[PDB]
């Protein structure tokens, strides 16, 4: 049974602790947070073997097989490296690193230590996205894909740390674009990126970008748009569409649950908006890919099944994003090398 | 670990066999069918310990804890009774019985043998329906429920046995109305039915009803409509709405997956319609409540946890349907006793 | 140019006055209301030739060709009869009469005086409903219709007069069922009703019914449901569906405008709900059939074109409703004669 | 009464002829086409005073007040100029010109002859778009707009002339982008474009672009996307969304009619797709803005009311598109001057 430690007992510590507690092949062994009280609380909610106040002792404890890192972005690099050196397998929430060189360093490392390194690209394990991908891959029906667009918009992360560059490593392009890039590439069966073009906005007053458009040109001729926002009210939106020479496919995560409700007051267990017509969620964690993702990882560790979707994909997406940042700065379409296309 | 036998290796044998193979607390031990080849097919598909050609030997085998009965409706009664007598726990696909007295007999028989009897009201375990129910139960927001309507329509069951009365026990009202009634009652927290009114149609030519409307009046004042059809082209529809003094809630199972696709041809693993704009399914079996239902039953048998939604609910719905059949015959709104309002 | 008088300058006086003011073949000549100030206001809004304080003088004035009666239901009968006797053509808002015998009396009368009598079944002139009907009539595609359902729900009429039986003539079955029955019959090309079955509710506390289901059996085998409510929050709903042996057709009036908006506050020109996700309206009057309806009537009067959809249809629907009331009272399915089917 | 001539009796000649025949303040006086038979067809369909075989005689006839030009794009410039010189008011289908200089020339020429020149930006007169614009303009509710995206996709124009550069003047970016740009600018109350960035595709084989993305940066900080395609199967899509600091607004023209239908075959007067689930149209011409646009123009000519949306807006959009073509060539974000940001 894969013995698991959660590192950072906030929102995603919580989600991963739920999924782990429910997996018959794993045991939620430990929870650690800089804030010992948040660690104890989460340890009790999901019946963890214990709360570990010490990172040092955590890493030394040979009873742990795997660490799930759900701390702020800027910590991911250092914490994952220490972890892999200590001999633990590691699942890191996105973004795996804050730059391509950070990511590449972790990949090098995991391999040196013969450990599983996985990253939190949960959507790529969302069952409705898995289906979407099979439909685009049905060449008789869909023909050849030529457009893919992934939209990811919300009213922005609440946590204080997501507003500082050192702790967040970036604004909306990094926070949400990682997911969108990775979804475009994967929806097209790991398509090779030839060029990248991006423009960023700062919508909210005085700074990290809170909105972005990034466009990729792929080898096979197709074009990928990633449209990403921290400044969209009205409820999170996660949608994709793919268009081929014969077909079309659309995916809708948050308004594709087939539930609607209306109240004046607001329903007790419905996030936002509260009042009026809403689209309540059912099994949002599963729908979003977290159970399958973590299940894949538990399986990789439990018995050396390499990962369907590996950290090389995180390197690729990191390069895209870094090239996007630079495309914006220079107002130009760019190769991943960084050089202008012309 | 709960050792399981599937009886009837057709479409729902297939579904239950999938759910059982995937449950860590159970083992798919056997598959049996009148057609030994269909049983072997399914046994291999889901890695069943074995294919049992013999009903007799199936029921005698003390390695089996639980039977799932997925045969034609007319057989359910007889098969479930023999099964409970043989000492096995049993989950029967709907409709549990073909009449209220058949259903009552099974419930009481299960009790005699101290067995868990469950029935296949899978939608009552559908996670999106469970969530719809919580929202209607949120009184501050929803207020008091006064209308519930469940719609269940398809182009009708293809199997020959579903067209004959003896093997099917009834037409669309029994086939689909069982689900719809049971959902109206449950969405309103086991609401008491005071009257029943129904009209049936024969749309497709020379006979079992193809289409029906059944309406219930509940104790609290609310009205429930069940609108049910074997003659709707264009893709199955499963749908509910509940309306209160303050709120509204709507549930859409098959066109509420958040997936759409278009092709001229038709996509490989997408049902009907094939061509043009479709609404592909993801995790249909889960979404429909089968995993949670069978899970509930596995749990009841395995670690003696009583069933959340028991077979008395099948008796209640059976009475509603039998009163609906009679309402139609007499052109009158009726009490469950059978007497006219 | 057809010279028009509006009688009752409230909400529907307002709508009809707009449509009339915009019709090149008519002239908004006069507005009359028991409340002379409401008449003057509406006369000014839509540039009416004058405000007429006297019903007597209104009816005697030979400059008026047509009267549009937008007063409370209970007045329709008497006002339309006086009008037709005075020699005026008449368009009466629904329900044309409060009972079948009232309606039959008006039909008799209009014919005696060789006048056009029309009733406010506007939806039957809604362009999206006209299309729906053509699609069901396309027998190759649709086959034979076997189900039609029309749903009509709102949070109920606000006017004081709609709560008293003498002034309203009935509750939700009469107010909304008239529209629904008439839509079912017309969507099926004037289908003959064989039986009627209905059950009514009183949802709001202490009385007129505020919710109803009525079901019709038609000659050709099809079944019609009319589901009608004064107790549905969240915005008016007007939907229909028709199902045949080959086809299906769905119509959505209020959430089929293809406009959506979100705000916290509420948009200035959007009715209800105010806040959160709404479905704003564009050209609601036209979409609802009022321009076409009134246009048909203006044409019938302007040049004796008999009406596509005549007051005989109002008699038929009145009989259905009266039979529905009785079906409810007796708990039985009934023939229009009133006799039980068995 | 405004006496009107239609030039080019194909699809849009047909549409404009319908709108004109129905306007009480105008008279459909003439129809002309290179193909005299197509002109006669259309003249009879909409009861035109006559079919004019001769362009020369058409322009000389002093009974005509206004010409509507619905010929292939390459002809617009020449035909509109001859028309304005002949003393006629003119409405030209998009794209008004094939380049900014062509457009500028016409505007100035119209002025010399004191004529109304309008262009076919019909969607800017679409009642549901007019309403979308009012909601974005409601500052308390919407806040400040920061994103606008207009999507315009179809399976591409069937006419041969639209595949050749000389007759079409451009591919999808010019054909559909003109509409999309003009809608982004107008939905934001005539927002000033500061930069333009675009990438084009050739999806269908050996050439004019089939597909494009064009992005504008506006003065106020907002960003506009125009996503345009000749290679999308499954039915035309026209769609916009605008996102502010507080609100959101979404507009859907072709799948926002509130009509759906299913058949195995296909419904008589329903376009593409034919079979399976479709979204039948009602009043498409009105919904698309043609009646209000032509009404505006009839009014301008008839009773000297200036145009709400004038041809300067066609110049602005033409500059955006020409800068987009150049952006694509150079792989760079560009100012309208042509210079790199
Ligand atoms: N895939 C997805 O959908 C999502 C991913 N995330 C990602 O998950 C990660 C965590 O996100 P959340 O929203 O933040 O949870 P958060 O802000 O709720 O929690 C952070 C937790 O980590 C603790 N912490 C901070 N620094 C620490 C350190 N150096 N050592 C140990 N513990 C420390 C804090 O006390 C806190 O309990 C982020 O990388 C974010 O990108 C977040 C939300 C959704
Ligand atoms: N939960 C749900 O939504 C649904 C439930 N059902 C129910 O599932 C049950 C089975 O339906 P399907 O699998 O659709 O039909 P099916 O025809 O697809 O399968 C029936 C199987 O039982 C076999 N069989 C017949 N006589 C037998 C006997 N005497 N002993 C053993 N096996 C025999 C048949 O050859 C066939 O293999 C029915 O009661 C139906 O009411 C069906 C569809 C959906
Ligand atoms: N087809 C449709 O969608 C609709 C139809 N209606 C119908 O229109 C009619 C009027 O409805 P509204 O909502 O009421 O407007 P309302 O209540 O706003 O106005 C009634 C007006 O008539 C005046 N009035 C009352 N009695 C009068 C009399 N005896 N003589 C002259 N004037 C008198 C009042 O002072 C008032 O101005 C009703 O029959 C109602 O069913 C109403 C709303 C929508
Ligand atoms: N507002 C909108 O959304 C749309 C606008 N259009 C525009 O409408 C215009 C016409 O397009 P369609 O009618 O689709 O093409 P079409 O091919 O359907 O019609 C063009 C007509 O002009 C005729 N013609 C060719 N050379 C001629 C000449 N020298 N003199 C007179 N007539 C001649 C052709 O034979 C044909 O009858 C195009 O500029 C296109 O940009 C087209 C589709 C939609
Ligand atoms: N308002 C709903 C919800 O907003 C936050 O949580 C949401 C998360 O923020 C949201 O994560 C998205 O947004 C995060 C913030 O931009 C991204 O870092 C992340 O990659 C993305 O998936 C996730 N997919 C849905 C989840 N429900 C917030 N953490 C949660 O407590 C609150 O209840
Ligand atoms: N909340 C929107 C609106 O509600 C009332 O007006 C609605 C009308 O009540 C509504 O009429 C429906 O409801 C009326 C009340 O039940 C029925 O008598 C009528 O036959 C039906 O069409 C109409 N189709 C739509 C119209 N917008 C109300 N008169 C109006 O002022 C208010 O602005």
PDB file of N, CA, C and O in Angstrom, chain B residues 208-244:
ATOM      1  N   UNK B 208     -49.089  -3.715 -26.384  1.00  0.00           N
ATOM      2  CA  UNK B 208     -48.521  -2.970 -25.245  1.00  0.00           C
ATOM      3  C   UNK B 208     -48.454  -1.495 -25.528  1.00  0.00           C
ATOM      4  O   UNK B 208     -48.142  -1.101 -26.633  1.00  0.00           O
ATOM      5  N   UNK B 209     -48.763  -0.683 -24.527  1.00  0.00           N
ATOM      6  CA  UNK B 209     -48.611   0.770 -24.660  1.00  0.00           C
ATOM      7  C   UNK B 209     -47.131   1.132 -24.939  1.00  0.00           C
ATOM      8  O   UNK B 209     -46.229   0.528 -24.348  1.00  0.00           O
ATOM      9  N   UNK B 210     -46.969   2.073 -25.877  1.00  0.00           N
ATOM     10  CA  UNK B 210     -45.741   2.763 -26.267  1.00  0.00           C
ATOM     11  C   UNK B 210     -45.377   4.049 -25.575  1.00  0.00           C
ATOM     12  O   UNK B 210     -44.311   4.594 -25.817  1.00  0.00           O
ATOM     13  N   UNK B 211     -46.393   4.656 -24.992  1.00  0.00           N
ATOM     14  CA  UNK B 211     -46.284   5.982 -24.509  1.00  0.00           C
ATOM     15  C   UNK B 211     -47.326   6.199 -23.417  1.00  0.00           C
ATOM     16  O   UNK B 211     -48.413   5.603 -23.414  1.00  0.00           O
ATOM     17  N   UNK B 212     -46.948   6.979 -22.426  1.00  0.00           N
ATOM     18  CA  UNK B 212     -47.809   7.188 -21.311  1.00  0.00           C
ATOM     19  C   UNK B 212     -47.519   8.485 -20.608  1.00  0.00           C
ATOM     20  O   UNK B 212     -46.387   9.003 -20.674  1.00  0.00           O
ATOM     21  N   UNK B 213     -48.581   9.020 -19.980  1.00  0.00           N
ATOM     22  CA  UNK B 213     -48.480  10.065 -18.992  1.00  0.00           C
ATOM     23  C   UNK B 213     -49.116   9.569 -17.723  1.00  0.00           C
ATOM     24  O   UNK B 213     -50.264   9.128 -17.732  1.00  0.00           O
ATOM     25  N   UNK B 214     -48.386   9.611 -16.629  1.00  0.00           N
ATOM     26  CA  UNK B 214     -48.934   9.281 -15.340  1.00  0.00           C
ATOM     27  C   UNK B 214     -48.731  10.476 -14.388  1.00  0.00           C
ATOM     28  O   UNK B 214     -47.641  11.034 -14.319  1.00  0.00           O
ATOM     29  N   UNK B 215     -49.760  10.824 -13.604  1.00  0.00           N
ATOM     30  CA  UNK B 215     -49.703  11.960 -12.724  1.00  0.00           C
ATOM     31  C   UNK B 215     -50.064  11.543 -11.326  1.00  0.00           C
ATOM     32  O   UNK B 215     -51.055  10.854 -11.092  1.00  0.00           O
ATOM     33  N   UNK B 216     -49.247  11.959 -10.368  1.00  0.00           N
ATOM     34  CA  UNK B 216     -49.520  11.650  -8.975  1.00  0.00           C
ATOM     35  C   UNK B 216     -49.819  12.925  -8.198  1.00  0.00           C
ATOM     36  O   UNK B 216     -49.173  13.961  -8.377  1.00  0.00           O
ATOM     37  N   UNK B 217     -50.747  12.821  -7.290  1.00  0.00           N
ATOM     38  CA  UNK B 217     -50.946  13.873  -6.301  1.00  0.00           C
ATOM     39  C   UNK B 217     -50.380  13.413  -4.968  1.00  0.00           C
ATOM     40  O   UNK B 217     -50.713  12.333  -4.503  1.00  0.00           O
ATOM     41  N   UNK B 218     -49.555  14.254  -4.359  1.00  0.00           N
ATOM     42  CA  UNK B 218     -48.896  13.893  -3.117  1.00  0.00           C
ATOM     43  C   UNK B 218     -49.540  14.573  -1.942  1.00  0.00           C
ATOM     44  O   UNK B 218     -50.253  15.518  -2.126  1.00  0.00           O
ATOM     45  N   UNK B 219     -49.263  14.070  -0.744  1.00  0.00           N
ATOM     46  CA  UNK B 219     -49.908  14.482   0.504  1.00  0.00           C
ATOM     47  C   UNK B 219     -49.704  15.968   0.805  1.00  0.00           C
ATOM     48  O   UNK B 219     -50.634  16.679   1.141  1.00  0.00           O
ATOM     49  N   UNK B 220     -48.476  16.415   0.666  1.00  0.00           N
ATOM     50  CA  UNK B 220     -48.112  17.822   0.879  1.00  0.00           C
ATOM     51  C   UNK B 220     -48.744  18.815  -0.097  1.00  0.00           C
ATOM     52  O   UNK B 220     -48.339  19.955  -0.086  1.00  0.00           O
ATOM     53  N   UNK B 221     -49.624  18.398  -1.013  1.00  0.00           N
ATOM     54  CA  UNK B 221     -50.057  19.279  -2.107  1.00  0.00           C
ATOM     55  C   UNK B 221     -49.281  19.204  -3.450  1.00  0.00           C
ATOM     56  O   UNK B 221     -49.731  19.735  -4.464  1.00  0.00           O
ATOM     57  N   UNK B 222     -48.108  18.586  -3.511  1.00  0.00           N
ATOM     58  CA  UNK B 222     -47.368  18.644  -4.751  1.00  0.00           C
ATOM     59  C   UNK B 222     -47.922  17.679  -5.803  1.00  0.00           C
ATOM     60  O   UNK B 222     -48.504  16.703  -5.435  1.00  0.00           O
ATOM     61  N   UNK B 223     -47.700  17.988  -7.097  1.00  0.00           N
ATOM     62  CA  UNK B 223     -48.039  17.125  -8.211  1.00  0.00           C
ATOM     63  C   UNK B 223     -46.835  16.605  -9.000  1.00  0.00           C
ATOM     64  O   UNK B 223     -45.925  17.343  -9.358  1.00  0.00           O
ATOM     65  N   UNK B 224     -46.836  15.306  -9.268  1.00  0.00           N
ATOM     66  CA  UNK B 224     -45.746  14.650 -10.002  1.00  0.00           C
ATOM     67  C   UNK B 224     -46.230  14.145 -11.335  1.00  0.00           C
ATOM     68  O   UNK B 224     -47.222  13.385 -11.389  1.00  0.00           O
ATOM     69  N   UNK B 225     -45.547  14.544 -12.403  1.00  0.00           N
ATOM     70  CA  UNK B 225     -45.740  13.986 -13.739  1.00  0.00           C
ATOM     71  C   UNK B 225     -44.602  13.042 -14.176  1.00  0.00           C
ATOM     72  O   UNK B 225     -43.416  13.371 -14.058  1.00  0.00           O
ATOM     73  N   UNK B 226     -44.984  11.873 -14.704  1.00  0.00           N
ATOM     74  CA  UNK B 226     -44.056  10.935 -15.294  1.00  0.00           C
ATOM     75  C   UNK B 226     -44.464  10.808 -16.733  1.00  0.00           C
ATOM     76  O   UNK B 226     -45.588  10.404 -16.981  1.00  0.00           O
ATOM     77  N   UNK B 227     -43.566  11.145 -17.674  1.00  0.00           N
ATOM     78  CA  UNK B 227     -43.895  11.215 -19.118  1.00  0.00           C
ATOM     79  C   UNK B 227     -42.933  10.322 -19.788  1.00  0.00           C
ATOM     80  O   UNK B 227     -41.735  10.576 -19.763  1.00  0.00           O
ATOM     81  N   UNK B 228     -43.439   9.290 -20.441  1.00  0.00           N
ATOM     82  CA  UNK B 228     -42.630   8.122 -20.679  1.00  0.00           C
ATOM     83  C   UNK B 228     -42.923   7.653 -22.066  1.00  0.00           C
ATOM     84  O   UNK B 228     -44.071   7.716 -22.490  1.00  0.00           O
ATOM     85  N   UNK B 229     -41.895   7.242 -22.813  1.00  0.00           N
ATOM     86  CA  UNK B 229     -42.104   6.953 -24.241  1.00  0.00           C
ATOM     87  C   UNK B 229     -41.111   5.971 -24.796  1.00  0.00           C
ATOM     88  O   UNK B 229     -39.914   6.033 -24.494  1.00  0.00           O
ATOM     89  N   UNK B 230     -41.619   5.076 -25.649  1.00  0.00           N
ATOM     90  CA  UNK B 230     -40.815   4.133 -26.421  1.00  0.00           C
ATOM     91  C   UNK B 230     -40.761   4.560 -27.851  1.00  0.00           C
ATOM     92  O   UNK B 230     -40.248   3.809 -28.698  1.00  0.00           O
ATOM     93  N   UNK B 231     -41.223   5.767 -28.142  1.00  0.00           N
ATOM     94  CA  UNK B 231     -41.456   6.134 -29.533  1.00  0.00           C
ATOM     95  C   UNK B 231     -40.878   7.537 -29.877  1.00  0.00           C
ATOM     96  O   UNK B 231     -41.299   8.248 -30.824  1.00  0.00           O
ATOM     97  N   UNK B 232     -39.873   7.927 -29.094  1.00  0.00           N
ATOM     98  CA  UNK B 232     -39.179   9.151 -29.325  1.00  0.00           C
ATOM     99  C   UNK B 232     -37.856   8.876 -30.059  1.00  0.00           C
ATOM    100  O   UNK B 232     -36.952   8.224 -29.516  1.00  0.00           O
ATOM    101  N   UNK B 233     -37.742   9.342 -31.308  1.00  0.00           N
ATOM    102  CA  UNK B 233     -36.451   9.209 -31.984  1.00  0.00           C
ATOM    103  C   UNK B 233     -35.503  10.308 -31.488  1.00  0.00           C
ATOM    104  O   UNK B 233     -35.926  11.246 -30.883  1.00  0.00           O
ATOM    105  N   UNK B 234     -34.223  10.183 -31.773  1.00  0.00           N
ATOM    106  CA  UNK B 234     -33.305  11.286 -31.672  1.00  0.00           C
ATOM    107  C   UNK B 234     -32.348  11.164 -30.506  1.00  0.00           C
ATOM    108  O   UNK B 234     -31.574  12.076 -30.269  1.00  0.00           O
ATOM    109  N   UNK B 235     -32.446  10.072 -29.749  1.00  0.00           N
ATOM    110  CA  UNK B 235     -31.563   9.812 -28.628  1.00  0.00           C
ATOM    111  C   UNK B 235     -32.347   9.765 -27.364  1.00  0.00           C
ATOM    112  O   UNK B 235     -33.257  10.580 -27.173  1.00  0.00           O
ATOM    113  N   UNK B 236     -32.004   8.824 -26.487  1.00  0.00           N
ATOM    114  CA  UNK B 236     -32.658   8.714 -25.188  1.00  0.00           C
ATOM    115  C   UNK B 236     -32.686  10.077 -24.437  1.00  0.00           C
ATOM    116  O   UNK B 236     -31.741  10.867 -24.475  1.00  0.00           O
ATOM    117  N   UNK B 237     -33.788  10.336 -23.754  1.00  0.00           N
ATOM    118  CA  UNK B 237     -33.862  11.473 -22.916  1.00  0.00           C
ATOM    119  C   UNK B 237     -34.216  11.040 -21.514  1.00  0.00           C
ATOM    120  O   UNK B 237     -35.245  10.398 -21.327  1.00  0.00           O
ATOM    121  N   UNK B 238     -33.368  11.401 -20.538  1.00  0.00           N
ATOM    122  CA  UNK B 238     -33.677  11.320 -19.083  1.00  0.00           C
ATOM    123  C   UNK B 238     -33.519  12.626 -18.349  1.00  0.00           C
ATOM    124  O   UNK B 238     -32.407  13.150 -18.204  1.00  0.00           O
ATOM    125  N   UNK B 239     -34.583  13.099 -17.702  1.00  0.00           N
ATOM    126  CA  UNK B 239     -34.685  14.537 -17.417  1.00  0.00           C
ATOM    127  C   UNK B 239     -35.643  14.685 -16.321  1.00  0.00           C
ATOM    128  O   UNK B 239     -36.559  13.915 -16.264  1.00  0.00           O
ATOM    129  N   UNK B 240     -35.376  15.604 -15.395  1.00  0.00           N
ATOM    130  CA  UNK B 240     -36.301  15.936 -14.328  1.00  0.00           C
ATOM    131  C   UNK B 240     -36.308  17.448 -14.089  1.00  0.00           C
ATOM    132  O   UNK B 240     -35.349  18.139 -14.456  1.00  0.00           O
ATOM    133  N   UNK B 241     -37.404  17.951 -13.525  1.00  0.00           N
ATOM    134  CA  UNK B 241     -37.417  19.285 -13.003  1.00  0.00           C
ATOM    135  C   UNK B 241     -38.265  19.293 -11.760  1.00  0.00           C
ATOM    136  O   UNK B 241     -39.188  18.526 -11.616  1.00  0.00           O
ATOM    137  N   UNK B 242     -37.913  20.140 -10.817  1.00  0.00           N
ATOM    138  CA  UNK B 242     -38.679  20.269  -9.576  1.00  0.00           C
ATOM    139  C   UNK B 242     -38.861  21.755  -9.390  1.00  0.00           C
ATOM    140  O   UNK B 242     -37.928  22.526  -9.614  1.00  0.00           O
ATOM    141  N   UNK B 243     -40.067  22.164  -8.981  1.00  0.00           N
ATOM    142  CA  UNK B 243     -40.374  23.573  -8.850  1.00  0.00           C
ATOM    143  C   UNK B 243     -40.977  23.795  -7.512  1.00  0.00           C
ATOM    144  O   UNK B 243     -41.919  23.115  -7.140  1.00  0.00           O
ATOM    145  N   UNK B 244     -40.413  24.726  -6.747  1.00  0.00           N
ATOM    146  CA  UNK B 244     -40.920  25.046  -5.405  1.00  0.00           C
ATOM    147  C   UNK B 244     -41.536  26.442  -5.318  1.00  0.00           C
ATOM    148  O   UNK B 244     -41.655  27.171  -6.354  1.00  0.00           O
TER     149      UNK B 244
END
